[PDB]
Structure 1
Amino acid sequence: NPNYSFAGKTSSISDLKEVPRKNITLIRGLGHGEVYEGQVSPSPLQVAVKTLPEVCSEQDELDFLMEALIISKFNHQNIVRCIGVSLQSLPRFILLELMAGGDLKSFLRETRPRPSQPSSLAMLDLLHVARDIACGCQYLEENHFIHRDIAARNCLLTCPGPGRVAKIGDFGGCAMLPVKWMPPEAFMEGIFTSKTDTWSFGVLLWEIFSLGYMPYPSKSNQEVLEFVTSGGRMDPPKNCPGPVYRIMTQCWQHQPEDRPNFAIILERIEYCTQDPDVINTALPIEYG
């Protein structure tokens, strides 16, 4: 039993809300540690169920428990909820707010304006997603928590249709490191502040406004590392309003001190949202 500290409050395995296994029913797979759609029981609660493999390392067990502690203490509308856990039966479960819209990256790619559906997305949809995540990030920042992998793949959506809400819903010899989302100083002193998350948010913004493209498309991890360290920056996504691209380039200031905090990022997203020239910009139609 390790303890976890968040907002000056310490919690352990015993503070987690244990849900009796018999109350939990798995309905279908979602992805993969595998994830299921589930329900907890007239009016059951539908949830997502993250499982721990029964045959796993000791470190796997510890990582799984620590994750549950961390997520359970987050309390914000743009961060996916932990409903409870079921650790006293095998395989062990973590129960999460079901995000029926899936991940943001897949969504953007699938919902690109095409000849089949030319009005599938608008600029305002993108700015609302951007605002939603910025709001989750500001909460993390205010509570002195650094995420380290603010990326489209780690954002989830409440529902596929309109009225969708984006939320931070996943965490991230270094071939696994999210290099394309990391600021120059991450590789230097390896130290993290919330200005790390500011940088990654700029990359997320590029991901959002490019409609789900991989950052630095023709560049590998090491190429990106050297590019970014030498001052290299991405071009604007296709049809990207200038005001939106300026948010990205401010997030990507080499000096962390010169980067905006999330309060400032939100203000600038809001000014963009109020600009008719920005929100009336047509998104590019991908040829289908």
Structure 2
Amino acid sequence: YCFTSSISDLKEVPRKNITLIRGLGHFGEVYEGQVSSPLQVAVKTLPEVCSEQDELDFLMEALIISKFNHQNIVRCIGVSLQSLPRFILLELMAGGDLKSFLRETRPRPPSSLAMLDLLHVARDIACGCQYLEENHFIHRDIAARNCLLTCPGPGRVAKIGDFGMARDLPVKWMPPEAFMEGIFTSKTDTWSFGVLLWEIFSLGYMPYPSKSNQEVLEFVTSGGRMDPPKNCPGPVYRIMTQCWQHQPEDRPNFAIILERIEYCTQDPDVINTALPI
């Protein structure tokens, strides 16, 4: 991997200074841990019962995440490969994953989130995606499940937190030239971000709600697109549909998406819109 970089360059942190407090999620388990005054981290694990391709998949991920340097991308604190099971030390973000956060902070009788908060989450991810595109990296799995938040209160920062699909399928998140032709460019991530925008403004709904995979395949290929989420404003939905243009030569880059997300923030008719319950 190059971004130029070898396993040489990672920070090998000894297993003696690592222990795992609690489990967080699961391919392969992921826990919360401590290191060293104590440092709080997230620990991704390679199960010791594994094959050869699993090994060069696990480290692959380690060098890729370690080569990034961006505030909207999960930091790699350290690495523990010389002790079985091999670890990847990652930035711990107390806000949890994005899909859970929106479904759990969904307003209910209360005034949990306003629309300005979700525009910030979308721009946080859009700025991280701009960093990937500028450095010619294609993610291939821009979804709400792979996004994390530093904290739950105001001032939260969203960050892309996983690179599982970027090894070297999420039908509902991929453009036609992806699932039918196997082509992947920076415009493939533009389509997925548009689906992510829909996840954000629907507050965690599953895209194409009652459609299975092949239904989405034939629906998207024939020109069909999703309806706006409940109470979604005009300028926001137009960003989703511009991301879902059939020809990738007409979808916008992440510099243009960032500008349009900025303008909706500068629109009182957008940020004063009430979220449903």
C-alpha deviation, 1:188, in angstroms: 3.1
SS at match of 2:44: strand
How far, CA to CA, are the matches of 1:174 and 1:269 in structure 2?
Answer: 26
Q: Quick one: distance in 2 between partners of 1:135 and 1:124?
A: 16
| CA-to-aligned-CA distance 1:170-226 (integer Å, 9 cap, x gap) | 124999900000001113321111000000000000000000000000110100011
For residues 161 and 178 of structure 2, the distance between their equivalents in structure 1, rounded to whole angstroms, comes to 23
Q: Is the 8 A contact 2:140 2:166 kept in 1?
A: no
CA shift for structure 1 position 25: 2.1
User: SS state of the match for residue 33, structure 2?
Assistant: strand
Residues 115 and 273 in structure 2, CA contact (< 8 A), matched pair in contact too = yes
Task: Say what the alpha-carbon RMSD is for the aligned residues.
Answer: 2.1
Aligned pairs for 1:1-288 (under 5 A) are 4-6=1-3, 10-32=4-26, 33-41=28-36, 43-115=37-109, 118-172=110-164, 177-285=169-277
Tell me the distance in 1 between the aligned counterparts of 2:166 and 2:242: 27
The worse-fitting range, judged by mean Cα deviation, of 153-162 and 170-179 is 170-179
CA distance in 2, matches of 1:28, 1:138: 34
Q: CA deviation at 1:11?
A: 1.2
Residues in 2 aligned to 1:161 and 1:40: alpha-carbon distance in whole angstroms: 26
Structure 1 segments, 4+ long, off by >4 Å, are: 172-176
Distance 1:37 1:217 in 2: 32
> Which deviates further from its counterpart, 24-33 or 81-90?
24-33
- Check the 8 A contact 1:148/1:172 in 2, yes or no: no
SS at match of 1:271: helix
Identify unmatched segments of 5+ residues in structure 2: none
Q: Which moved more, 1:164-173 or 1:140-149?
A: 164-173
1:86 CA displacement: 0.6
Per the TM alignment, residue 73 of structure 1 is displaced from its structure 2 partner at its CA by: 0.3
Alpha-carbon distance change, 157 to 175 in structure 1, aligned in 2, over 3 angstroms: closer
Question: Offset at 1:40?
Answer: 1.2
How far apart are residue 102 of structure 1 and its match? Answer: 0.9
Decide whether the 8 Å contact of 2:124 with 2:158 is kept in 1: yes
TM-score, normalised relative to structure 1 = 0.93
Unaligned 5+ segments in structure 1 are: none
Give percent identity, aligned residues only.
98
Query: Aligned residue pairs: how many?
Result: 276
